[PDB]
Design a protein around this ligand. Structure first.
Ligand code: HEM
Ligand code: HEM
Ligand SMILES: *[C@@H]1O[C@H](CO)[C@@H](O[C@@H]2O[C@H](CO)[C@@H](O[C@@H]3O[C@H](CO)[C@@H](O)[C@H](O)[C@H]3NC(C)=O)[C@H](O)[C@H]2NC(C)=O)[C@H](O)[C@H]1NC(C)=O
Ligand SMILES: *[C@@H]1O[C@H](CO)[C@@H](O[C@@H]2O[C@H](CO)[C@@H](O[C@@H]3O[C@H](CO)[C@@H](O)[C@H](O)[C@H]3NC(C)=O)[C@H](O)[C@H]2NC(C)=O)[C@H](O)[C@H]1NC(C)=O
Ligand SMILES: CCCCCCCCO[C@@H]1O[C@H](CO)[C@@H](O)[C@H](O)[C@H]1O
Ligand SMILES: CCCCCCCCO[C@@H]1O[C@H](CO)[C@@H](O)[C@H](O)[C@H]1O
Ligand SMILES: CCCCCCCCO[C@@H]1O[C@H](CO)[C@@H](O)[C@H](O)[C@H]1O
Ligand SMILES: CSc1ccc2cc([C@H](C)C(=O)O)ccc2c1
Ligand SMILES: CSc1ccc2cc([C@H](C)C(=O)O)ccc2c1
Ligand SMILES: *[C@@H]1O[C@H](CO)[C@@H](O)[C@H](O)[C@H]1NC(C)=O
Ligand SMILES: *[C@@H]1O[C@H](CO)[C@@H](O)[C@H](O)[C@H]1NC(C)=O
Ligand SMILES: *[C@H]1O[C@H](CO)[C@@H](O)[C@H](O)[C@H]1NC(C)=O
Ligand SMILES: *[C@H]1O[C@H](CO)[C@@H](O)[C@H](O)[C@H]1NC(C)=O
Lengths: 551, 552
């Protein structure tokens, strides 16, 4: 019944029904005009001819290493390029946010209700004849058939980019502060009301949970010492709620900011490292300010760690992830003369694209042992047995799996990958090509163009029939990757806008926050600006072992 | 004992303790340097020479009417000036917000917790020797004495700008959507978690309250017809909570978005008008969109009424109180090429300054009846007896009181004015002169310079002793007003930045929202851009009576 089902409006245009069978496109500030916002303006047609494709831009950033080495050592040029990447990625994000799972139009409910994930593209209306609008069959192909034919792992495919298990667990740990689906409400709802890098996975979402995790002396968090080593406190000591199977004994029930971090020893590894980092910064600030009380020591330490997180994410995590020869920089001062909104809302599509379960290996290799999924999960004894030092050493060496390229999802995690497909359909996601068009990409003309391959493409041809009906999530995992890279085009071009906006949109990056006094003076400001994944491990892990995000 | 108690850092520099008896001033991006951020930069010194005083700017804006009449008719010049008044005012507001009642330093708790009012200036630390820091006596002057000497009304002092009761009640109605103090928690806490113009005073703060007020047909809100006239529904029929005394009959307990709006018929008048406006917009949108369901019709009408509100507040309400000959403009497009943050947090000081109880007359005059406070309060039968038409006609004629100039607070609300002094002390407010410096104003050197008069000044000097110890709230009500104006310098120079930032910081003013599609097309978009206080009354009140924010 809805005439906007076909998604007729192009180039960020907005559809609105003007009757039972009539529609109108709003072409305001698109650079286009006409019935479908397709006829380009004079300034736009010049920009389209001069605009290089993402593949060409990726090529320049991954080649000419000698030139980039000179570029990285000229401060004003490095700053200018990094300034451009922050602005050009961020304008792709709507801020303040617009749509959500229940609203395909703008409303005060969609803006004001923080329990929703926002949406990059509006949901397909309930009264549309097909799930994708008008194209394809009345039903999408069975999710289990899609899972088994093109997604599930036959043999382990390693990442050619060299990502290790330190990278995979950092990704899981970091993103689980802002990806916290409220399952009793639905897939499109979140428990992370801060919508970004607030470190609620260390400090808790609520004030009650935070206060239960705090020592209330010297700004520190509660901790226990087992075998001479500092670990998170217990559930018995703190009374915080954690997700644990009934057989886990009281002494192994570790209590951290996020309730699900006891599921994986890899997560509990980073939880321990960051807890140790917080108390370490408290010691530094206590030395600097003996006149400060517990409360200010805690709050200032939290702000420093937020700064540290964004610094590490940009200059180590995303740096390795992009695979660029250009040296990325975390510098809020770059946006001070630029139009930028210091706010963020976590998008549902950002959640979906970040389901990087192909990263997971067949077995988890620590020291001399190889642990299966059943042996590894919920089993924090492994952490106490080997220790943090051995965890860092082992996970730095162990190669993670390739995400794009197809057929690399572990069978032990098949239900989660099936859920990603089923819940995307529940939230009425638009097709892959619609999302590609939304982020300035050319739509795929065939399944062979998507995969860069013949076998999987033919299997997807029989299931979906049409390329304009292909779903976003399965396409991301099967997509043709860049030369010796972990991801394909769509992942980088959707992920970069969401990521950088969520990192720079933090209040600590705003002009009134980005100053030494915010972080307790020059000493706290220095902790942020000199932070790295290596120094995080060196200061908090015994022996100062070597680590990086690649093998 | 805290070294930052004296407030040593000047020009918006930040104080940080570097020991038990040592401090450090962070002069980052202030334009100043030195131990106290007092030594100006080269370009800062130049800017301070060319920068005119607020009094000089006010003069030019309130004089040369023949020149402004030409300026208003030149669209690019009108846009240029309005752009400047938006950007230069908003620059004074920290966004994202910083301090609150419990935090004199920046923290995540202060940023994230929406239950707090934000603070333009940090609170005086709990360990400071005096309430204002280091200056003054151990205790501030008796609040009863301050109230009775310089604040209380002897005889009614009318506003020289001509403000009427339509203005007074609009101010109360409008601001009470974001000024909603959570007295269960304390004076520094709010119930208005939207922190701006969301129209929760019509639609409810919570979703549960909204649905109890909604008809769920044609996007409309529930209503009743009493004597051929549309009024809000009852508490009995809807189960929405309202604050009423136990003696009020069921048929007189009207239920609206804001729980306190049964307090005065003046609030209920505007509640009824806006309720009628929402359902009127619902009929307009149904004509344009027969295919639309109830949910979309309701949500689109809300966004439209939010647009109408900001339009009326800028072009009619703020226009009148400013007293400028320059025609102000509501145009979000003015900020699309400017650095601006589309977010807002309500400041405690903005709440404090907006306590405009001197506006209230001794009696409320409707038709040929003069109602006392005792007769007026919690009495919705007055509204039913006279009707909305007579209410609008009467309130347009009745002069409101002068806010500044001292001694004009109605005795009936003396406890409210005393509470404002007490709660400001409770929230550990910095001095008047500290807030003046914060908003780029020269500090007063005497109480005579503050009042422009000799009697009240001497009364305040006997109480406070020092001008640097004078409190913000009482000073706003006793300040020397501008020529024939309602407010003094401090009220305007604090009020304008808070007000304009709140209005333009609304998401509907952002580029992705500010387009016809958001408001149901060109028809719904026109409703916003043509909205006025006259049109609001004309479309919703029988007989389209003349209305204005000033007396004729
Ligand atoms: C260590 C082994 C892992 C296990 C056992 C695991 C398991 C799970 C499970 C059970 C869910 C809930 C699915 C649902 O909604 O029904 C989930 C969601 C998710 N997974 Fe994993 N996962 C693992 C590693 C990872 C890694 C390395 C990443 C990469 C970032 C990742 C990304 C995500 C994300 C972003 C979600 C959604 C979170 C939310 O919205 O609440 N996972 N995973
Ligand atoms: C119509 C007669 C009025 C009465 C009877 C009245 C009474 C009151 C009372 C009792 C309070 C304290 C609320 C409480 O603590 O329970 C209050 C607060 C306040 N008044 Fe009025 N007032 C009136 C008119 C006005 C007007 C015309 C304005 C101008 C805008 C105004 C501005 C305010 C503001 C901004 C607050 C603070 C609200 C809050 O923090 O929640 N009032 N008033
Ligand atoms: C953000 O949006 C969410 C989705 O609308 C809201 O969550 C919903 O709140 C509703 C109202 O409280 C709940 O309705 C329930 O069912 C009926 C009305 O249909 C009522 O009689 C019940 O009292 C009410 N409560 C329950 C749980 O039975 C919804 O159940 C609830 N959940 C969902 C996913 O729809 C959020 O409230 C909203 N957040 C805010 C702050 O407004
Ligand atoms: C925004 O800040 C508010 C002020 O700090 C918070 O409100 C306070 O939350 C506290 C609970 O986290 C309450 O204090 C008490 O804490 C003890 C812990 O030992 C509990 O047992 C009590 O149940 C609890 N309250 C009671 C009933 O005594 C405060 O009552 C409460 N209010 C004030 C004015 O302090 C908000 O929680 C915070 N908002 C968010 C979202 O974090
Ligand atoms: C080598 C110099 C280029 C700087 C890197 C810019 C980062 C990528 O920039 C991206 O490029 C895409 C293709 O042009 C566009 O679709 C995106 O809008 C843009 O953000
Ligand atoms: C010469 C400027 C006239 C244009 C009207 C601007 C509206 C008032 O602008 C205000 O002026 C004050 C005094 O100059 C400043 O302290 C404020 O920062 C500024 O916002
Ligand atoms: C109409 C007379 C106005 C002058 C009152 C100011 C002088 C202080 O007089 C006070 O007036 C209050 C209000 O009536 C009373 O509650 C106090 O008992 C009284 O002391
Ligand atoms: C969330 S997945 C992802 C993949 C690739 C990314 C690349 C960049 C670089 C810096 C760019 O802007 O091109 C940034 C973030 C990215 C995130
Ligand atoms: C809340 S009290 C108040 C007093 C005076 C105001 C003046 C202006 C004008 C348009 C300006 O910016 O000078 C705007 C808002 C104002 C608010
Ligand atoms: C938990 O870890 C221990 C030691 O690494 C191992 O022996 C045991 O098999 C694990 N438990 C489970 C349930 O597999
Ligand atoms: C309420 O107003 C009516 C006029 O409609 C008046 O007769 C009555 O006395 C008032 N009630 C009170 C309590 O003063
Ligand atoms: C928009 O494009 C053209 C108008 O140029 C028209 O033929 C077409 O039907 C419209 N809609 C769609 C679904 O392409
Ligand atoms: C700050 O100003 C000077 C330093 O130039 C210093 O002597 C003085 O003591 C300070 N003033 C205050 C407010 O203490």
């Amino acid at each position: 019944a809805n005439p906007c089902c076909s998604n007729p409006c192009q180039n960020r245009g907005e559809c609105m029904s003007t009757g039972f069978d009539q529609y109108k496109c709003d072409c305001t500030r698109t650079g286009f005009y006409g019935e479908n916002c397709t006829t380009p303006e004079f300034l736009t047609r010049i920009k389209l001819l001069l605009k290089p494709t993402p593949n060409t831009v990726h090529y320049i950033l991954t080649h000419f290493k000698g030139v980039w080495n000179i570029v990285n050592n000229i401060p004003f040029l490095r700053s200018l390029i990094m300034k451009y990447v922050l602005t050009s990625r961020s304008y792709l994000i709507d801020s303040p946010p617009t749509y959500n799972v229940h609203y395909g139009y703008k409303s005060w409910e969609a803006f004001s209700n923080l329990s929703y994930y926002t949406r990059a593209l509006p949901p397909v209306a309930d009264d549309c004849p097909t799930p994708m609008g008008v194209k394809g069959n009345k039903e999408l192909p069975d999710s289990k058939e899609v899972l088994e034919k093109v997604l599930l792992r036959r043999e382990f495919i390693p990442d050619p980019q060299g990502s290790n298990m330190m990278f995979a667990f950092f990704a899981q740990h970091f993103t689980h502060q802002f990806f916290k689906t409220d399952h009793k409400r639905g897939p499109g709802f979140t428990r992370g009301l801060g919508h970004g890098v607030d470190l609620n996975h260390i400090y808790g979402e609520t004030l009650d949970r935070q206060h239960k995790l705090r020592l209330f002396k010297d700004g520190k968090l509660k901790y226990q010492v087992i075998g001479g080593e500092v670990y998170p406190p217990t559930v018995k000591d703190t009374q915080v709620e954690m997700i644990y199977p009934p057989h886990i004994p009281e002494n192994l029930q570790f209590a951290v900011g996020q309730e699900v971090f006891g599921l994986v020893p890899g997560l509990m590894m980073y939880a321990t490292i960051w807890l140790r980092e917080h108390n370490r910064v408290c010691d530094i600030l206590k030395q600097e300010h003996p006149e400060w009380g517990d409360e200010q020591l805690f709050q200032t330490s939290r702000l420093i760690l937020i700064g540290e997180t964004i610094k590490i994410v940009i200059e180590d995590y995303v740096q390795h992830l992009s695979g660029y020869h250009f040296k990325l920089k975390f510098d809020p001062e770059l946006l001070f003369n630029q139009q930028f909104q210091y706010q963020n809302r976590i998008a549902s599509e950002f959640n979906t694209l970040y389901h990087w379960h192909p990263l997971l290996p067949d077995t988890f290799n620590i020291e001399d042992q190889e642990y299966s999924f059943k042996q590894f999960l919920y089993n924090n004894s492994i952490l106490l047995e080997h220790g943090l030092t051995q965890f860092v050493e082992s996970f730095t060496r162990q190669i993670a799996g390739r995400v794009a390229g197809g057929r690399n999802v572990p069978i032990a995690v098949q239900a989660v990958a099936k859920a990603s497909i089923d819940q995307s359909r529940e939230m009425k996601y638009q097709s892959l090509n619609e999302y590609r068009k939304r982020f300035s990409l050319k739509p795929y003309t065939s399944f062979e163009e998507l995969t860069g391959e013949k076998e999987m493409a033919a299997e997807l041809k029989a299931l979906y029939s049409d390329i304009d009906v292909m779903e976003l999530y399965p396409a991301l995992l099967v997509e043709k990757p860049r030369p010796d890279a972990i991801f394909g085009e769509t992942m980088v071009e959707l992920g970069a806008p969401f990521s950088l906006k969520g990192l720079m949109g933090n209040p600590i990056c705003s002009p009134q926050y980005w100053k030494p006094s915010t972080f307790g003076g020059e000493v706290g400001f220095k902790i942020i600006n000199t932070a790295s994944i290596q120094s995080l491990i060196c200061n908090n892990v015994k022996g100062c072992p070597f680590t990086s995000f690649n093998v």
